[PDB]
């Protein structure tokens, strides 16, 4: 166990990134003149996060520079801002310089770019999108059946995410990117060749290697290796990739799960005086659960909508429990979790074509009875196509993965005593 | 003609396999304590062959291990053994270890598995079964008419046979396997898909390719290719395969014919000092005929049964002449061959529910006046369904296949001078 130094270094690094994010949000709130209530709005924090993400999108910035937009300059950003006077909420659009946002981000991080914070914000946005909306249209359009949605974790993450974004995204998103590449390859013949051919080939190499590392058992690993070997892949290995994503429902790969909290929680924590540089942090440890335990976040509530359902959606987005079992999610939270079918709430974002006269603000109940450590595994699983098919046959609805690994009480900060759950609906998108 | 080295190598290999089989039978006879008369019984040799085949059946061994039988352990084998004291035959059941049988087989083959000998024994058993019994029940059950039986050569060969077993079995057996696959596919929809789907698809691929190579003329080859092309075959190509087997009666495929002698003959030859490693061997040459010429085999004869008919049945099983023309078979043997209809004999095997008081032993007259080289061809034949039908129309009961290819005298070991036969009943199962 020589990792203690390495683990402490990683904890210090993630704590530094969290502290930088919190101080940046504090600076943005101070400069934008929002009260304590207005600064704690999740919509305002999401708007600020989109501010940062659009400011630092280099490819998008260059695209807007060299193709100008229609009536929208490529130099400034916008975002919905909600402020309260006389008790009533209204939305107004602010215009802020991309250069100013970048300078604020650099200053809040001791003059360092700190792409880790940007990736963390992107992962939080992707988790929110996954927990809120279903992209079955993209599934059906590319040829994959809408039947599988568990593997679509992190499907909204843009390519600018680093290695963490690739690790956190599911097998289905990688397969979707692969099929998009294959479709673009069937479209035209001048592909795989030329100057762009080398770049697209190395991109295929890297994405197929991260899918290589994502998987668990040897037969499906060999299958992904073989479909990689194809120089000019086409329709047969199109169906091969469809089958490979198809087999992931039974023998899943290792997909990372992280607790990416909104910038509002980090800003409130930093405003309280918490210094994550010394105390450390861990995206899979108790720290995010404890931070959510003693943090208050307010959200805009549409008419005839349930605040409890929106709070549950926000909690699942925060903890990336969109595809987590309903029973274990209810046990961890302590309140029975409502699947997406009977969620009487729309998305947390408020559209432009909405009335600023019938909206109310409610506190988000982001409190959980139990806390658990997120696992990046896939579960116990113990020609090659027939071998893979034979593996699915063996699985019975009783195999117990993570044997001896339970949940822990919030007071149990080091996880001395796990709690064994005893076990209705079990699928969020069912 | 650069095959002389290849032909000599193949002759040496088959001679080595025959020598291994003979020495193995000698070892088994020595250890089981049978006299010269008892060791020459065809029933005892068949029992020893079943010993070896059941010992090395890996799938059957695993099945018996993990589903145990009722009162029969999965560790040992049994078989009828007939011994003579005071001149009277009795049957007693011996219990021998599968591990011991396997060790004896490996030792008798210089520590080599030698699956060629196992396949040769299986082909001998299949030829005996084809020459003895008619499996019209399996034909009618699967939907094919009982009308055709010529194509049913090697229908009793298990799947564990190698490429030689697939080559020696007839078109009808391959069609029977194909229709069994189709019936299992119509039974359930979850077929062709899943982990087992890939394995069954490649199995269909390989069996359809060996049927591909079995056939002779181009139109029927194209037809089998097209029925192969079907991803999820059903009733229409069910009838297509019925027609394809139906057309084989007129335009036959290339079915190999081999002289698989019983282990008794090989054991006697090895006991005489014959070394097949140096002299070589050939399953289609004069060597099996000459070996049968100077070998004596005794068999158990049931009451009111003709030894001549049983000897003829054993000879046809040995030379795989079950479906051979009656006239040419009589000409080669030198004695008029009795078809199965008036054969006054039952199977060579003696059932358990039989009396050990009215059975007698007689010598098998496995001597033939002439010897001929076995041919693996099918005969001269010189939409696609109509084209195939038109081909059957042309055939007239006079086309002479193997023109200039006659029989040869036993003294003519290199076949200098063929003998042209001049030509009653002509069908064994008629």
């Amino acid at each position: 166990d020589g990792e203690r130094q390495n683990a402490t270094e990683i904890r210090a690094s993630v704590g530094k990134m969290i502290d930088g994010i919190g101080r940046f949000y504090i600076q943005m709130c101070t400069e934008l003149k929002l009260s304590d209530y207005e600064g704690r709005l999740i919509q305002n924090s999401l708007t600020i996060e989109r501010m940062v993400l659009s400011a630092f999108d280099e490819r998008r910035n260059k695209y807007l520079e060299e193709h100008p937009s229609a009536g929208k300059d490529p130099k400034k950003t916008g975002g919905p801002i909600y402020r309260r006077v006389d008790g009533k909420w209204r939305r107004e659009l602010i215009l802020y310089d991309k250069e100013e946002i970048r300078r604020i981000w650099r200053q809040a991080n001791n003059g360092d770019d700190a792409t880790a914070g940007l990736t963390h914000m992107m992962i939080w946005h992707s988790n929110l999108n996954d927990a809120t909306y279903q992209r079955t249209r993209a599934l059906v359009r590319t040829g994959m059946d809408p039947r599988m949605c568990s593997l679509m974790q992190g499907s909204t993450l843009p390519r600018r995410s680093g290695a963490a974004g690739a690790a956190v995204k599911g097998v289905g998103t990688m397969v979707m990117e692969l099929i998009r590449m294959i479709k673009r390859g069937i479209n035209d013949r001048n592909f795989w060749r030329g100057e762009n051919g080398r770049r697209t080939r190395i991109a295929y190499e890297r994405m197929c290697n991260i899918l290589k590392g994502k998987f668990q058992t040897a037969a499906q690993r060999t299958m992904v290796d073989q479909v990689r070997e194809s120089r000019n892949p086409g329709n047969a290995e199109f169906e091969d990739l469809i089958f490979l994503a198809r087999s992931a429902l039974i023998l899943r790969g290792s997909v990372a799960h992280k607790s990416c909290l909104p910038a509002c929680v980090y800003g409130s924590a930093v405003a309280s005086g918490y210094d994550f540089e010394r105390e450390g942090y861990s995206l899979v440890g108790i720290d995010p659960f404890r931070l959510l335990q003693n943090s208050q976040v307010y959200s805009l509530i549409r008419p005839n909508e349930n605040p409890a359902h929106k709070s549950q959606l926000v909690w699942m987005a925060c903890h990336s429990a969109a595809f987590e079992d309903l029973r274990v999610s209810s046990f961890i939270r302590g309140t029975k979790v409502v699947p997406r079918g009977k969620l009487s709430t729309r998305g947390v974002q408020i559209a432009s074509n909405e009335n600023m006269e019938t909206m109310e603000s409610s506190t988000l109940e982001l409190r959980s009875r139990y806390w658990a450590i997120r696992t990046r595994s896939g579960g116990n699983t113990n020609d090659m196509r027939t071998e893979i098919i034979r593996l699915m046959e063996s699985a019975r609805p009783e195999d117990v993965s993570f044997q001896g690994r339970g949940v822990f009480e919030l007071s149990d900060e080091k996880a001395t005593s796990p709690i064994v759950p005893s076990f209705e609906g079990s699928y969020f998108f069912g | 003609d650069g095959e002389r080295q290849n032909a000599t190598e193949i002759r040496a290999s088959v001679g080595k396999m025959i020598d291994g089989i003979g020495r193995f039978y000698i070892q088994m006879c020595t250890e089981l304590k049978l006299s010269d008369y008892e060791g020459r019984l065809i029933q005892n040799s068949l029992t020893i062959e079943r010993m070896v085949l059941s010992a090395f059946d890996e799938r059957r061994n695993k099945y018996l291990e993990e589903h145990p039988s009722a009162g029969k352990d999965p560790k040992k084998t049994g078989g009828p053994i007939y011994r003579r004291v005071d001149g009277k035959w009795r049957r007693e059941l011996i219990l021998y270890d599968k591990e011991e049988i396997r060790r004896i087989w490996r030792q008798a083959n210089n520590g080599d598995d030698a699956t060629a000998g196992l396949t040769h024994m299986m082909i001998w058993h299949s030829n005996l079964n084809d020459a003895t019994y008619q499996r019209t029940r399996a034909l009618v059950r699967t939907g094919m008419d009982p009308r055709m039986c010529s194509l049913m050569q090697g229908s009793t060969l298990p799947r564990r046979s190698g490429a030689a077993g697939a080559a020696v079995k007839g078109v009808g057996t391959m069609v029977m396997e194909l229709i069994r696959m189709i019936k299992r596919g119509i039974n359930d929809r979850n077929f062709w898909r899943g982990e087992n789907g890939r394995r069954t698809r490649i199995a269909y691929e390989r069996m359809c390719n060996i049927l591909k190579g079995k056939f002779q003329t181009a139109a029927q080859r194209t037809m089998v290719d097209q029925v192969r092309e079907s991803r999820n075959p059903g009733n229409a190509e069910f009838e297509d395969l019925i027609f394809l087997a139906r057309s084989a009666l007129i335009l036959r495929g290339s079915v190999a014919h081999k002289s698989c002698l019983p282990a008794c003959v090989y054991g006697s030859a090895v006991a005489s000092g014959y070394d097949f490693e140096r002299e070589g061997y050939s399953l289609v040459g004069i060597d099996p005929f000459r070996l049968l010429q100077n070998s004596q085999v005794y068999s158990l004869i049931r009451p009111n049964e003709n030894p001549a008919h049983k000897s003829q049945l054993v000879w046809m099983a040995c030379h795989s002449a079950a479906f051979e023309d009656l006239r040419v078979s009589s000409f080669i043997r030198g004695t008029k061959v009795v078809p199965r209809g008036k054969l006054s004999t039952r199977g060579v095997q003696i059932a358990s529910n039989e009396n050990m008081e009215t059975m007698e032993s007689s010598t098998l007259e496995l001597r033939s006046r002439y010897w001929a080289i076995r041919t693996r061809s099918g005969g001269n034949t010189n939409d696609m369904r109509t084209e195939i039908i038109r081909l059957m129309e042309s055939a007239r009961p006079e086309d002479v296949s193997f023109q200039g290819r006659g029989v040869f005298e036993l003294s003519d070991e290199k076949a200098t001078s063929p003998i042209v036969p001049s030509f009653e009943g002509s069908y064994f199962f008629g």
């Binding site: 059946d145 809408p146 039947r147 599988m148 949605c149 568990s150 593997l151 974790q153 599911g170 198809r246 429902l249 039974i250 899943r252 997909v255 799960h257 903890h319 990336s320 429990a321 969109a322 595809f323 987590e324 079992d325 029973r327 274990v328 046990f331 961890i332 658990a372 450590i373 997120r374 696992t375 595994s377 896939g378 579960g379 699915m392 046959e393 699985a395 609805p397 009783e398 195999d399 117990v400 993965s401 993570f402 044997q403 001896g404 690994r405 339970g406 949940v407 064994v420 759950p421 076990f423 079990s426 699928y427 969020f428 998108f429 069912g430 | 929809r189 979850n190 898909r193 899943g194």
Partner: peptide, 26 residues
Amino acid sequence: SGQISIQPTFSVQRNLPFDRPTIMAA
């Protein structure tokens, strides 16, 4: 249709459910 099997996020002992009447058949 809908969601079928599961995406293990938390390290808790469980019995990961799947719906064979449609997944096994394809």
